[PDB]
Design a protein around this nucleic acid. Structure first.
Lengths: 213, 150, 165
RNA sequence: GGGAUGCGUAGGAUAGGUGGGAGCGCAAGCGCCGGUGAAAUACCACCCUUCCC
RNA sequence: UCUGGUCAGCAUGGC
RNA sequence: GCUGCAUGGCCGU
RNA sequence: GCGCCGGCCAACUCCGUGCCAGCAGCCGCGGUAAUACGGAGGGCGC
RNA sequence: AAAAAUGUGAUCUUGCUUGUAAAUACAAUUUUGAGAGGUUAAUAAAUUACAAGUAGUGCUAUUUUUGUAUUUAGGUUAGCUAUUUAGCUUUACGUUCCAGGAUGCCUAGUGGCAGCCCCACAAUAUCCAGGAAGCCCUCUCUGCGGUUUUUCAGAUUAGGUAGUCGAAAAACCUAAGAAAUUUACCUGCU
């Protein structure tokens, strides 16, 4: 909740993670919060994207739907590119489309393309919450890609709680806290009660145990 | 009752007594001639429309029309209950023939200068080959009434 | 001279009292194709025992005239029922249209009348300048000199088309 | 809180959800992939329904 | 039996 | 014109 | 001389009358053909 | 309705709740004759249209060619009696006359007939039973209805039972004073 308290949470979490000094691979930090006194039945549920101020550390898988330029940038970035030609083909084959949707967290699409993508893709993508974000045809993707990586999705579903990826072991405790704050901000905005709803908050490394704020 | 059963001379065309009775039912004002004609013409109608011989069609009709049981009122201690009872064999014919002619008159179709088609159609409708028509209705209705108050 | 001569100013036919075109708008139909125009009027006098007690009344009345419409009407008009076309029938002023009057309160009024000559015909005769009296302005009054006389009046019409009787 | 539980159709099947996920495991198996579907499933978590303590 | 019907078919007492 | 309760006759029932 | 003449009870007709006037022992009689009221003729009784 | 294509940010539509809008008519015969007064007092059914929210579904969201057209229809949710068929009228519970509209449901097929495009037969149940007339009665003109007061002897010659209100009169209806007074069934005494 308060910055100092979260800093302790984060600091403690890092120390606890063990087995060895640290796993060979860099673990990631997850923030989990439980909510209270909110009816999940109503549109109280939260599904939203948050741009973390310091990126996720993984830079979320992103797909780009578009043509030259936009497609070129996507390839340079190393992102999957779905070309304009493929859109109809994918609408036809649900089998592939389903797989594509499951694999990536976010989709970015050339804005002009939006009519076609919803016509063909929308049935699969929309239910998922996967619908693409439009960007101008001659936009610069890099900043967006960074944010979306460096973007994370908060999806409560009907359940009372949420788990989100806040950062990496690589990043500083200060950064992790800043990212956590961005997440917290969304909840504060959604309900009138605000943060009061948060029953309990916890931080945890991949391997490490959760520690309550 | 009215009188002793007088025997009726059998029909000139097919010497069937039952037919004459039917003819009597049709006739009124003693116009015996018109009455015979209507029945004969109907028989001809039965021949064309239906492959079967008219005499057979008619007899079958009467059979469908005769009520087996009828309800007669009677005064019991309270109210007059309608006792169901069998019907005399003599009674059944008079009812059947009478009901045919009445239902036949009932038909909308006004065919032949006279009534003759209504009789023709009525009889066929009666047959149980076709056991429909107004005549059969009355018959079925009476039987239904009986055994309702079994 | 020509001025003095008598001509007919406005006549106007009319119809009986009561509602008109009761079954359907009718009775106006007569008066229609007759005289060329179609007037309608209304009435006052609410409680009528066998009349209405309607206030504003549909009551049929109508027609008028001009010059020349009532000529070519009042042609094949007179030469209609006139047991006595004229005599006592019309009076001092010039022309009239009547029948037998009834004892009713008369005289102190503008003098419209029930009187029925034909489907109450109204030939009104006036000579002269007379537009003087009628017209709004210095009205003036008829001279009671150059006024119509029944004798003169039962002249003119009579000279033409039909006998005085 | 701990152990259970969740049966339209399609989907090798009883899919309560959502986020992470290209892997978990010596292997077998399991998952990804492929596919069906409105939604995808291993594995790690969090939020639920109902039942038990 | 009904003071049945008819003095208006006719007849007939009385008024 | 009265009285069929003053009657004949005749008739209905 | 006197009573009576509808039945009981022997002795009957006319007229007057018109539920009136009247009669009446009981039953009753008189509302226009009254042997019952009143007179008369006639009759019965004594 | 069918076909093809662009394409609004792919795309896609069966519904639930709130707000506003309009029809569903009415007159007439007949009634104590007419008009006026609350056709009341009551409480208003439900069909379609647009907007928003919402599961839906990203919301408004196109153009060109072809046959008349080759589409779905039709019915169905009126009352009453009835154990079924059916029947009666055709829908009534404030009383009289009438429309069935929602969803969901039924036949797409069977029987007669030479044949049929020719005749017959199915259909649950919840929704509102809605609309007009119509309202003990009151005032006026003033109503073939019907008021106001009085008298009541006595049946060709009289009585016994009795004749729509016991009868009759004159008259009242914006005013009611006022005065005369029957009979049918049926019969008698000396």
């Amino acid at each position: 909740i308060t910055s100092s308290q979260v800093r302790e949470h984060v600091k403690e979490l890092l120390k606890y993670s063990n087995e060895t000094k640290k796993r060979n691979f860099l673990e990631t930090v997850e923030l989990q919060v439980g909510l209270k006194n909110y009816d999940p039945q109503r549109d109280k549920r939260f599904s939203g994207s948050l741009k973390l101020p310091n990126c996720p550390r993984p830079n979320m898988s992103i797909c780009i739907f578009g043509d030259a330029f936009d497609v070129d940038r996507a390839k340079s970035c190393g992102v999957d590119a779905m070309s304009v030609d493929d859109l109809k083909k994918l609408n036809k084959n649900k089998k592939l489309i389903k797989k594509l949707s499951k694999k990536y967290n976010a989709f970015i699409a050339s804005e002009v393309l939006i009519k076609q993508v919803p016509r063909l893709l929308g049935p699969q993508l929309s239910k998922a919450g996967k619908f693409p974000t439009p960007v101008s045809h001659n936009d610069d993707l890099y900043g967006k890609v960074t944010d979306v990586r460096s973007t994370i999705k908060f999806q409560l579903k009907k359940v009372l709680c949420l788990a989100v990826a806040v950062g990496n072991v690589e990043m500083e405790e200060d950064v992790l806290v800043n990212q956590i704050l961005m997440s917290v901000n969304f909840f504060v905005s959604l309900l009138k009660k605000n943060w009061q709803n948060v029953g309990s908050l916890v931080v945890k490394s991949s391997m490490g145990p959760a520690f309550r704020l | 009752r009215y009188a002793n059963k007088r025997f009726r001379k059998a029909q000139c065309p097919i010497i069937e007594r039952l037919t004459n009775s039917l003819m009597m039912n049709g006739r009124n004002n003693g116009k015996k001639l018109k009455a015979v004609r209507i029945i004969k013409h109907t028989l001809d109608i039965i021949n064309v429309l239906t492959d079967q011989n008219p005499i057979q069609v008619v007899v079958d009709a009467i059979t469908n029309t005769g009520p087996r049981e009828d309800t007669t009122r009677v005064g019991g201690g309270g109210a007059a209950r309608r006792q169901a009872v069998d019907v005399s064999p003599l009674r059944r014919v008079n009812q059947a023939i009478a009901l045919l002619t009445i239902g036949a008159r009932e038909a909308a179709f006004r065919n032949i200068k006279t009534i003759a088609e209504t009789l023709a159609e009525e009889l066929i409708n009666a047959a149980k080959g076709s056991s429909t028509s107004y005549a059969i209705k009355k018959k079925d209705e009476l039987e239904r009434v009986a055994k309702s108050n079994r | 001279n020509p001025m003095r001569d008598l001509k007919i100013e406005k006549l106007v036919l009319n119809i009986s009292v009561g509602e008109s075109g009761d079954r359907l708008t009718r009775a106006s139909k007569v008066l229609e194709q007759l005289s060329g125009q179609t007037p309608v009027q209304s009435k006052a006098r609410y409680t009528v025992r066998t009349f209405g007690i309607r206030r504003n009344e549909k009551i049929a009345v109508h027609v008028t005239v001009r010059g020349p419409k009532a000529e070519e009407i009042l042609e094949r008009g007179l030469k209609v029922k006139e047991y006595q076309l004229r005599d006592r029938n019309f009076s001092a002023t010039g022309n009239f249209g009547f029948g037998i009057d009834e004892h009713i309160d008369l005289g102190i009024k503008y003098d419209p009348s029930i009187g029925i000559f034909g489907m109450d015909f109204y030939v009104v005769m006036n000579r002269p300048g007379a537009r003087v009296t009628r017209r709004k302005r210095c009205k003036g009054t008829v001279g009671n000199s150059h006024k119509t006389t029944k004798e003169d009046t039962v002249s003119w019409f009579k000279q033409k088309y039909d006998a005085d009787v």
